[PDB]
Design a protein around this nucleic acid. Structure first.
Ligand SMILES: [Mg+2]
Lengths: 68, 622, 514, 11
RNA sequence: AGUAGUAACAAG
């Protein structure tokens, strides 16, 4: 459907709804310590990017690079 | 006991609990199929209120043009299209008198606006009609097509950047004997039928109406001038006190007491004061474009000839306008089990034995107007956007309410904004009150203003309504005139918050959302937000995929308050906060190593309303 | 600066002038040199004296009751049952987020062991009755078929059987052909655009609304927290809100608000993804008990037909199979569009003995649209409007005293508000009842939304305001009172909700003019 | 007993 | 059938 709200809800329900640069695969691990998969090897059809789960965002914010 | 909310009004004054007479919680009445039938009604009604005018045949167009102005002074209480020039000019004249220089100055401030305005301003519009495609298109897309087809037909005065210089291309386009679309070439006769076009669709999402209505949208030729017309009208309406436009509810609330004060404090103990809760009927269909030309030309007395011409064009175009019929009609074969959409063009030459007895009547009456299968509408103002200039006229009659111009025991003042008005009549006795009311009502009929007897009423000054502001002895409404969805906006965690929070703020400022209501709106927004982005607070037992990740982050963080709602943090927003970006709001409270990641520009999520650049500002898959 | 009216444009401009001004420059001259001279004064003395605004005095005697239409009793058009619905429930001490609805439903279904051989009771007058009974049997069967499947499905798409192909309207529309290939046809007339068939006010729409204002034993809404009350207004705001959210928390209308959202949301999602699948959508709501434990409820099942929606107006057909204890033969006029089965017996052991009521199923072919579903999902704005109505009512009554009457409004524990009517006359309720009533109204305004209502509300408001001006002793007068009525009554056709809102107006008027 | 949500099994 | 109400949907 054309409505963005509805679309977003549908999107977030999928495993990997977020687009991010291939570099993420070096920075963060593929699996969280409970086993939850954070990013996928599936390449983006448009740019040099890969498919990523919202868990990745949260993971970066608790384990990630502290720059002042 | 059987419950009956309506019985509240036994204890409560209707004005106080008026909020309870509005059913704006379920879906609105949407029109199904084709509003082609609804247009022909609007055309056939418009030509009925103007029946006794003079029929002309246009030199360029060959359209049967009806002109009801200076027509037979009405003999019944029906809707009259017969406005009198001498009366409209007198009204304008007596305005310039009561407000010295009002036209002089407006013209000067509008000339500046003409010499500044960029073609860019046209893109900021509704679903316009693109003559380039003969289709309803976005305002930006319709202009880009027009400028391109104009560039390829030897017209690049728009290249300068000014709108005035584009409007010259519109003037010069009328002369060119062939116009070619990138490849289809049409003659000058068939081009002018596109330039003077109002495309028609039924109005969806209209409340307080059983049967659907026929709205109309103009071409990208007229658009440009109407803006400049409405700029002048605005410049005047700003200088007029009885005008309810273009001001907000902030000033509009005050304007009700502003006017009631005038009529009550002056009045001695021997002086009646009756307020009429007003509304004018068939407003659009009963104001003739030639009267707006008549107005403009009077306003632009002693002004440069170029300026007069620019403003004069809109009403001339509107006076020779042609209204497209619509999508058409559908036909159903009960025996063969067939359906078929007959396009509106074919309504010109088609069997009348196919339609029903009422729909046949309309097809017959409109036929004599059909040129290029697009019915001409020379009179009326079928959803025209002269909302402001039409207010100038309305006010100009309220202006004629001073003892100076009445020269009687009775007098009046009021508020006007397009069709809606509110009038106070002062007199020594009941006969004077009636005589004054009649005086106004008839003085209106002379300028084609037909007050609705059904949808209006009069009472002792103290309680009344104007533009849905319910006044009661100084107190005005103070409730929300249309509520948006306070759910997720559908962008990203960081954006959606900043949008949804601001939405509520804007409604509190503009629409008058109650504080307690705003808090529940916030409560509901947060509920939807947390649900959508699986970012339920870190101390909750709720189970999503993101649960563990947020739970861990919550456990590690010292200053919980720091965390964004997006990171399982607590909602710190409230009525006083609704204008601070969450990251700003929670900046001081954050853990150093937290914001050191959240804001770290070396993040993979961003490529690189008040937005704050964080790891939440990601892009969805498409 | 120059801007000149060109050849083609001048020839137009000259035709667009008042009569007998054959040139623009001619006309401009008249205007430029116009000095007014009693033109209006003269034309007024000239004009007919028939044209005027005669003021009909509005007296306690003048207003008659509204003219409610005569005919057959109005039927139930609500998408799901309200007062008649029945729930198969389970406890949910898993604190689970969006738990798979199919399994919640099955777990619910397994709690009941009183199923019978289904037999039709009140048959749908214009429908293939045996198709409905077959559909329920197919539903019953296909839910067992899951149990003996190598894997477990997340969602059940029903087998496109004879019965389901009929109930959802599979290939029941005429075929679209070009006008050229069917121009010469014998009965090719336009679509029927008749008046809606006029129906009379049934007694049940009131009975439905009475139960909407009822309190329940369960908490039906859970709203999230906000920041600490600091600013002065924020204290008043959170005071007003917390009081209201207390009276409304347990109200039955709140159950309907969730019920509608939970159905419409799921229906609109399935409408988009499973366009060609006959998806089984179970009707589920979740709530907190008197004790506090989480509780999942099943009202019945909804099979969605083919959902190819391009326009917001374009319709999706479905079948509402809903559990109920209500015997349909009590008020069979209400269930005009419904085919009611007897699908089991329930046993309730009460303190006055062993009660054995029978379990019905209100099966019905229905439709909805993207717009209608979207506005079903946004039903929670019923709470916002409901609260707005109270907040505005307080804001007003407070402004006269110039002192916030919030705490006074709610803490005043004395039944003072005229809200209902018994044969005794007008009955007074509490602010709590007011809140729930004002919510229920706002909910039914959403459930039974209709142009009839939209219009009636708009016009009746006018008469209502006039009536108040009389009670204020403000010598009210109308211009065309009859006209106003004709415009009001024009909307009173067949909508139970509208007809009731009209009945209510009459009820009020009676006591208003006394 | 509540006709909307009545208890039909014992515990 | 059903939604719907002054014309549509009951796929193309
Ligand atoms: Mg009004």
């Amino acid at each position: 459907e054309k409505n963005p709200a509805l679309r977003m809800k549908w999107m977030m329900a999928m495993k990997y709804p977020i687009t991010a640069d291939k570099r993420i695969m070096e920075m963060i691990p593929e699996r969280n310590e409970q086993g939850q998969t954070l990013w996928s090897k599936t390449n983006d059809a448009g740019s040099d990017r890969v498919m990523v789960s919202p868990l990745a965002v949260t993971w970066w914010n608790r384990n990630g690079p502290t720059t002042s | 006991m059987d419950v009956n909310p309506t019985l509240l009004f036994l204890k409560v004054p209707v004005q106080n609990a008026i909020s309870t007479t509005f059913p704006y919680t379920g879906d609105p009445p949407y029109s199904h199929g084709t509003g082609t039938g609804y247009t022909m009604d609007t055309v056939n009604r418009t030509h009925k209120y103007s029946e006794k005018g003079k029929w002309t045949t246009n030199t360029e167009t060959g359209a049967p043009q009806l002109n009801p102005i200076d027509g037979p002074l009405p003999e019944d209480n029906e809707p009259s299209g017969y406005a009198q020039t001498d009366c409209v000019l007198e009204a304008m004249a007596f305005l310039e008198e009561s407000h010295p220089g009002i036209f002089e100055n407006s013209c000067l401030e509008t000339m500046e606006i003409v010499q500044q305005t960029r073609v860019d301003k046209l893109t900021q519009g509704r679903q316009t009609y693109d003559w380039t495609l003969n289709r309803n298109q976005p305002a930006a897309t319709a202009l880009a097509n027009t400028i391109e087809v104009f560039r390829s037909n030897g017209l690049t005065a728009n290249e300068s950047g000014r709108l005035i210089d584009f409007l010259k291309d519109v003037m010069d386009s009328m002369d060119k004997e062939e116009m070619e679309i990138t490849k289809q070439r049409l003659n000058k006769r068939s081009y002018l039928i596109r330039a003077l076009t109002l495309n028609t669709m039924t109005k969806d999402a209209e409340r307080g109406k059983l049967k659907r209505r026929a709205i109309a949208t103009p071409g990208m030729q007229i658009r440009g001038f109407v803006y400049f017309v409405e700029a002048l009208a605005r410049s005047i309406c700003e200088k007029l006190e009885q005008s309810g436009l273009p001001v907000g509810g902030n000033e509009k609330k005050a304007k009700l007491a502003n006017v009631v004060r005038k009529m009550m404090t002056n009045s001695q103990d021997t002086e009646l004061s009756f307020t009429i809760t007003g509304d004018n009927t068939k407003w659009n269909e009963n104001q003739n474009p030639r009267m707006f030309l008549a107005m403009i030309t009077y306003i632009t007395r002693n002004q440069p000839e170029w300026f007069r011409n620019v403003l004069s064009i809109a009403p001339i175009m509107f006076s020779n306008k042609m209204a497209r019929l619509g999508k058409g009609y559908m036909f159903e074969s009960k025996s063969m089990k067939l359906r078929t959409q007959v396009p509106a063009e074919m309504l010109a030459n088609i069997d009348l034995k196919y339609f029903n007895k009422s729909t046949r009547e309309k097809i017959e009456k409109i036929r004599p107007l059909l040129i290029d299968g697009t019915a001409s509408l020379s009179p009326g103002m079928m959803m025209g956007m002269f909302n402001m200039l039409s207010t100038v006229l309305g006010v100009s009659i309220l202006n004629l309410g001073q003892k100076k111009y009445t020269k009687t025991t009775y007098w009046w003042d009021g508020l006007q904004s397009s069709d809606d008005f509110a009038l106070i009549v002062n007199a020594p006795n009941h006969e004077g009150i009636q005589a004054g009311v009649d005086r106004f009502y008839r003085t209106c009929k002379l300028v084609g203003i037909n007050m609705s007897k059904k949808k209006s009423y009069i009472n002792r000054t103290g309680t009344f309504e104007f533009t849905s502001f319910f006044y009661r002895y100084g107190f005005v409404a103070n409730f929300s005139m249309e509520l948006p969805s306070f759910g997720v906006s559908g962008i990203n965690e960081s954006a959606d918050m900043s949008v949804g929070v601001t939405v509520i703020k804007n409604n509190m400022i503009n629409n008058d959302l109650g504080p307690a209501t705003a808090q529940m709106a916030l409560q509901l927004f947060i509920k939807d937000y947390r649900y959508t982005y699986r970012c339920h607070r870190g101390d909750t037992q709720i189970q999503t995929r993101r649960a563990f990740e947020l739970k861990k982050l919550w456990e590690q963080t010292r200053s919980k308050a720091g965390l964004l709602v997006s990171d399982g943090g607590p909602n710190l927003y409230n009525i006083r906060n609704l204008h601070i970006p969450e990251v700003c709001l929670k900046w001081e409270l954050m853990d150093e190593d937290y914001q050191g990641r959240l804001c770290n520009p070396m993040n993979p999520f961003v490529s690189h309303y008040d937005a704050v650049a964080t790891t939440h500002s990601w892009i969805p898959k498409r | 600066e120059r801007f000149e009216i060109t050849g083609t444009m001048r020839r137009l401009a000259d035709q667009s002038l008042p009569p007998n001004f054959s040139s623009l420059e001619n006309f401009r001259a008249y205007v430029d040199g116009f000095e007014p001279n009693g033109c209006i004064e003269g034309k007024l003395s000239q004009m007919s004296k028939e044209v005027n605004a005669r003021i009909e005095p509005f007296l306690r005697t003048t207003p008659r009751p509204l003219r409610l239409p005569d005919g057959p009793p109005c039927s139930q058009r609500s998408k799901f049952l309200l007062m008649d619905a029945l729930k198969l429930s389970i406890e949910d001490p898993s604190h689970e987020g969006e738990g798979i609805p199919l399994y919640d439903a099955i777990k619910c279904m397994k709690t009941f062991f009183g199923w019978k051989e289904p037999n039709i009771i009140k048959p749908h007058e214009k429908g293939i009755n045996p198709n409905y009974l077959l559909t329920w049997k197919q539903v019953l069967a296909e839910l067992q078929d899951i149990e003996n499947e190598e894997k477990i499905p997340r969602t059940k798409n029903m087998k496109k059987t004879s019965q389901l192909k009929w109930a959802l309207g599979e290939n029941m529309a005429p075929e679209k052909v070009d006008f050229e290939d069917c121009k010469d046809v014998n009965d090719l007339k336009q679509y029927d655009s008749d008046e809606p068939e006029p129906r009379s006010l049934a007694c049940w729409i009131q009975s439905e609304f009475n139960k909407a204002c009822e309190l329940t034993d369960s908490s039906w809404v859970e709203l999230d927290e906000i920041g600490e009350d600091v600013a002065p207004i924020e204290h008043i705001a959170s005071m007003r809100r917390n009081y209201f959210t207390a009276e409304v928390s347990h109200c039955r209308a709140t159950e309907y608000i969730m019920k509608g959202v939970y159905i419409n949301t799921a229906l609109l999602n399935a409408s988009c993804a499973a366009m060609d699948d006959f998806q089984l959508i179970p009707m589920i709501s979740k709530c907190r008990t008197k004790e506090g434990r989480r509780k999942t409820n099943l009202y019945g099942f909804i099979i969605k037909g083919r959902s190819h929606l391009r326009n917001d107006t374009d319709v999706v057909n479905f079948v509402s199979m809903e559990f109920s204890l209500t015997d349909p033969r009590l008020e069979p006029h209400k269930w005009e569009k419904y085919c009611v089965l007897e699908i089991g017996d329930m046993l309730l052991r009460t303190a006055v003995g062993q009660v054995s009521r029978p379990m019905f199923l209100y099966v019905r072919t229905n439709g909805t649209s993207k717009i209608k579903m979207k506005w079903g999902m946004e039903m929670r704005r019923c709470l916002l409007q409901s609260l707005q109505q109270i907040e505005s009512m307080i804001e007003a009554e407070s402004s006269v005293k110039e002192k916030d009457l919030t705490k006074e409004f709610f803490e005043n524990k004395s039944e003072t508000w005229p809200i209902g009517e018994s044969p005794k006359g007008v009955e007074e309720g509490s602010i709590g009842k007011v809140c729930r009533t004002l919510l229920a109204k706002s909910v039914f305004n959403s459930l039974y939304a209709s142009p009839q209502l939209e219009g009636f509300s708009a016009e009746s408001r006018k008469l209502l305001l006039i009536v108040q001006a009389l009670r204020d002793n403000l010598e009210p007068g109308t211009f065309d009172l009859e006209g106003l009525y004709e415009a009001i009554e024009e909307c009173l056709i067949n909508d139970p909700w509208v007809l009731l809102n009209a009945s209510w107006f009459n009820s009020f008027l009676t006591h208003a003019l006394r | 007993y509540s006709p909307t949500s009545p208890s039909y099994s014992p515990t």
